[PDB]
């Protein structure tokens, strides 16, 4: 301590040609350097100027980032670099911290990892893929003016420039895009089926600042996989993910956006037996689905494997199930279910001030597809007891829940690293079939009556679409 | 009312990698906001400052285009944007008016939508393709000065910069580009034929600012359909088009232009049964065709289905019909179509100040070449109720019809959605081979003799060449 | 005249991705507009600024070309825009000057219209493809102050900025690229062959500013001929081209570059017949061959179709002949031709100032490979009526004549449009195949007893590589 | 001399896709040129500045370079360039001295021709592929003042600017890069492995500033060889070449970097028989390797053909062997071989200050695996004529030796022009498939022994792995 002593650093984003970020995903509006000695205890934290870095973009060294030495504690002897910090790592990153305590877990929110305008993307530290133990920590090249080695300050600015430490740096989050095959979708005979909004659900609330990383047995050079605060899956619970949920007055998430943008979540992995659909980030695709014959857009019904084309058709068979003397096994279901049905609707009638028919035989498709989301009030209440019943595909909207398969390589049953979103991966996923309609109402893998139920494991999710993941590592570009 | 509030815009431009248009085709000259109630009543309009919105092109945030949040009427609920307003909506766009007024129907000229000088395209709210009753205004995230949950105005400015209202916006016209097969033509045995200038036919003299979705039954995911001014079959009239006309001094319009160039129009749908030949947009494709054993760009001519090299040898079966001492129905015939032929002849000769010979046996091929647009004038007088007789291929010079087809999942005979031009949209047209001479003048598909024939069917239209037409988003790309 | 008259312009340069030209082929120093009537008079030349048109290059206009309207004669009919005019075309262009006048055949060095430093390409009108007779005057749209149509300078200014004359232009030289297939280039059993610098020979001397278009029979869209100055075969004289020669001293043509480069020459047609091998443009390509068992880069030699590793080898057979008590045919034919080629090598010996032996016999490698161009002086002298004899390959050094195709869709021995060098063309040649040595000499189609002598047919050359030839539009780019 | 003479220069950058090297391996920081009299006596240095020559960079001129002529001796006859000179290189390069002393061999560290920052790479004249025997400078277009041919300075300067002495320039090192297959890698049953960071091994120690260019035979076009200071066999020695070694306290060589990172070497060629393994140039590709049943990441060990699990499992053979009342060869060879372990172990362990077990039977995994590069001590020790024993793959890591190839159409046993690395060539490595683990230690082909020992044939090598060696030349782009 005491003595002068010069570093210099360069700063390095992913870099590989088809998967380059955008000029947003690369933006720069602050570097902080966390200096640590030989103990992994923080002596200082700087906050960076140009003047005090390379900046490498894309394989090359961007113009205004001067890379000068600058001065640091003698003691230093590694060095983290955190591009775009959020507020909770610069309060957490202080001088005396260890990094045992710098890196602990924490919750984020999306916005708080990439801004509120998509263009503050936190990066850290990469690590080694075939080091893991090595762990975040990058050897700083000190260059500590003895007067022997290193004789004066200019001697020691010098070395430092011409020694710099290289800090390759990856993004915190993930990137998702979404979108169906360019050559057409195949269909089953007569559906017409049409994408339209989507949005990622399941995604992390929380996150190390550095996570582990973990190489999976079977797995690909460069699909590295990682351990997130919430791995094990005797500690799941729904307080650990974002679901997506429909407002009392039947408003859609805000989340749900055009299959042209491209979506961003929190890193979420998964020990192999926690490979279970209520834990596993999800893209969740809405699409306007008819059945052959049926008009685009329309209303239509599905109650106890049948298909109708519209209420009134429905509203036929409960009829001649009520006007039945002494009612059979089949038609006191479709009464319990169309009645089931009728409470839920009458119910979202109340919550957004909207005036429906007395009973099921009453109520009309004018008085229905009125109601906003219609559709997610024929969804069955879990803490009731209630299973499918009717479901109202309203104006024909269902959803498709995709669960985010990782590494491509892995395909056994609930092998370790075949599903999951690591950090600084860009997630493609290509719709190239539908197989049947999805649900009325937005997926929900979790059980209402059971916060710790982690729900059913992800290799038994029934197919309704056939859809391509492929991953690759999300670089940057020069100009 | 009389509330501080605060709003941020985002304006998004069309995005996806072959499909990007130019940088005329993106380039902003004037952005106007409008606002409404929640009842669609516009509140105020505002002409924006690079300083008040975000500018999002090909997927990027453009540097210049700062997002500042700006002061708006409490009440505001909804936003339009419009990028390059023409000046009929600049004077319909107004506070005070209704969305439905100011979305009325209008008539607008290709240069108040686009400029003079290509680089003006007018664009607004593109709407969502699976949920088309919403409409074309989006939610506008407004920031009220409450004291309460919000306390300030600057509070106000950060929440409201913090949550931009993102607009995506659609260009109003959409782009056809004209080809040949790179790796060649195919074309009839020993024929030359080459492709030159040419145009778009039967475009929209009307559209509606924003126009409704439609989506047809055995659609593509994308490939949106709309509803223009012009759609039903029992209101078509030749006053709603723009078509193709020769001047009367035999001068082309200056509608043609090299196949190097893209051309654009208004958007132009049909109903089903209104997919007719009068009311489709179509590229007017000009030819030099010179059959084999002739000279290129010799003048020929073709009578009865007999193609002859020189006038001379027609005037030898006119004259050798004229000297017939009894002329019998194929003789008859011959003379009746030259003359009719002729007086057409001489009626463009008259109108051009040009000397011909007296009869059909007078005139020579130096008379007829020195016509403009000669061609034109072998094409039958259907108001006298004449039939094709002589064709005059001037120079070779021939014309063909291309209906441009809209979504190519869509082939059944008449079905709803498979012609069309639709905004925003970017048609390739690509010319694979040549079955057959084309016609000596542009195509008329219209009835001189009554303006409400809609023409012939779109799909018994008589193949002359193979064409592939393609159909892309027409998108923008970020430097 | 007299009156105010106001007009616009843009100047596009040629546009279709692949063959986009360099910035400095695009590179503008200077235009010139000259304003017709409608008898094709030039009324006044002008030398634009940068305010006084657009400039649309890869299909965009260029920031800083304002398109600003100027005054202009009000007899002005017509216009005719040069990029970057030779000094020659800029005093045969001047007011008073006919448009027949100024478009006089000319002859122009390679720099006098690319610039000696090749960011100076002359570039003129193109011309209308499928309207050959419409020559290069463009419609000039002039607005005329009448105070009736036309009230004021202020509108005559807004409506020739609103209605501007777009000029497509071409640049008067063609391009052309050599290089080796990719993938490995097919020799025969066990030879080496590697290519070295190469040269265009056989360019033409002169040009008409705008050559007229003649469209082939079986010629394809895009690939318009031209009529150039030495176009039938009777006017044939070596004098009207640009060839190939060693210089006294034994120094090769400057002309001579790298593979790499691209290399530029006026444009080079024929009528079918004139398609000659003395005016045919060509690809002179150099190369080091080396026969199975020989070592690379060391010379070769052949003679009466026997190759000789050395030159020992070939005097042996010499002085076996000398010994014969009585030559026969065979022993007397190879004392006359090595003393023929020996007298050669004693020429060039005393021409670069070096010690040969006496004779055939008493001449060494060494004296043989310290002259420049060795090989050359193997070449037969024509004018003494010597044929080929004895080749000495210097070093392995070997020469080949790649004759230019035109349109690849003609193939019909000796027909119009097969072979050609034309404006704004740029033609890629590969070499896939060697099949044997090529010349020691440089190539050599013309006749030293007759310089009217046209050569052989094209058609008519023997094969020495297999070279594929693509023909495509030289486009531009924009930033 | 003593006469005013002027000359202009173009410093022309490797041309042409896809092998465009970054803006930092084409970045200038100074350029040197060294005019020469027709002796190739240096007759002046000049150190250049902007305005003092044209800079073509990916075929076209940059901006900023003028290209202005400048004065030179009259007696200048020929030039040569250098881009970023080394400091060695302007000591040499000084006038007086002659081209043969300049260009004499010399020692270089990497860092002094390509900047520690790597955006100053050393560039030198190319010379000529067909002409090697011309050397590496370029005839000077010298414009002296004679009164007669040249009046004054004002046309000495025009001319010399109207024909500039064109000169192309190579980077003098070569580029490498590794990567694995995209569509996976191919590798044993049950075998995960997966590659981490590389190096370059057996690189250049010294270089000449111009190479000869060789030509061998079978060869092809553009993948011209080079005579370097260490080509001839006899002459080998260790001190010749840059080795990989681990430090004393097991840390591994700076040298290794991320497989997304490029390397770079000075130029290394060889004399066909010259083509051996501890003088050839390689990649050292380190991975973990994971037998089939084993946990990725742990230590695993490999004896006499068997594989162990763990060290446990090693000791109860270890053991049994020594249990034995009379030990048999196998037995015996068994306590040899963990004995000659143990003890490097040991020395190891006392290198480090760490702790382990007094024999072979006493230690454990958690001592082993806390020394650093433990897999590097189970490497025999040759010169006390040790050699393969026990294999300690630490965490599972092991090291891969790839001999990089120079010209793919060679592929004859020990061909010339088969192995080596050539001046501004960029190697791709395409790893493929893995056959085997590799070793534990990093790859050492030379003998401790024996410095002047050139190690085994290059095509001797047994293969661990299956790579794709592409060879492009390492161009240039411009902006
Ligand atoms: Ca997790
Ligand atoms: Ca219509
Ligand atoms: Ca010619
Ligand atoms: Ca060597
Ligand atoms: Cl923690
Ligand atoms: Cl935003
Ligand atoms: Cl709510
Ligand atoms: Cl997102
Ligand atoms: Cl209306
Ligand atoms: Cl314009
Ligand atoms: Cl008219
Ligand atoms: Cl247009
Ligand atoms: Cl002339
Ligand atoms: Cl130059
Ligand atoms: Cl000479
Ligand atoms: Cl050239
Ligand atoms: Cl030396
Ligand atoms: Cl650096
Ligand atoms: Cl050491
Ligand atoms: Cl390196």
Redesign the interface.
Known sequence: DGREAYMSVSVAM???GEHHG???EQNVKEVLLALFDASDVCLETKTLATTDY?LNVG???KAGYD?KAFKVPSATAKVLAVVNPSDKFKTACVASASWSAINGAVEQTL?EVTG??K?NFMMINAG??????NGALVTANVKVVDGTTIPDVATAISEA????S?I?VDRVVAKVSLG?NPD??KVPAGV??????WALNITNKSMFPYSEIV????????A?YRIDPNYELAGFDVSQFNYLKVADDGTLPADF??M?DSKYCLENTMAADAQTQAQTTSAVA???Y?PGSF???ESWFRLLGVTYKTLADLQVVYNAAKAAGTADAAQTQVITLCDQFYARIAKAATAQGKAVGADFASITITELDDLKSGGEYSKPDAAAGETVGVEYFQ?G?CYYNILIHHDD?ITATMAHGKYGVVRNNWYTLTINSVKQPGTPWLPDTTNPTDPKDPGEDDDDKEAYLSVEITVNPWTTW?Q
Chains 1, 2, 3, 4 share one sequence.
């Open positions: 992913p870099k590989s955008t000029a947003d390379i394989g090359a060294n890379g916005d509120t305008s263009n080694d893929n075939a080091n893991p133990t420039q011409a020694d710099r290289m390759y169906t057409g979708l017409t089926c049409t994408f339209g909004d190489m999976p047995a079977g797995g690909s050079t460069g590295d956006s055009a042209a809405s699409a306007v008819t008009t685009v857009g104006k909207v390589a020069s």
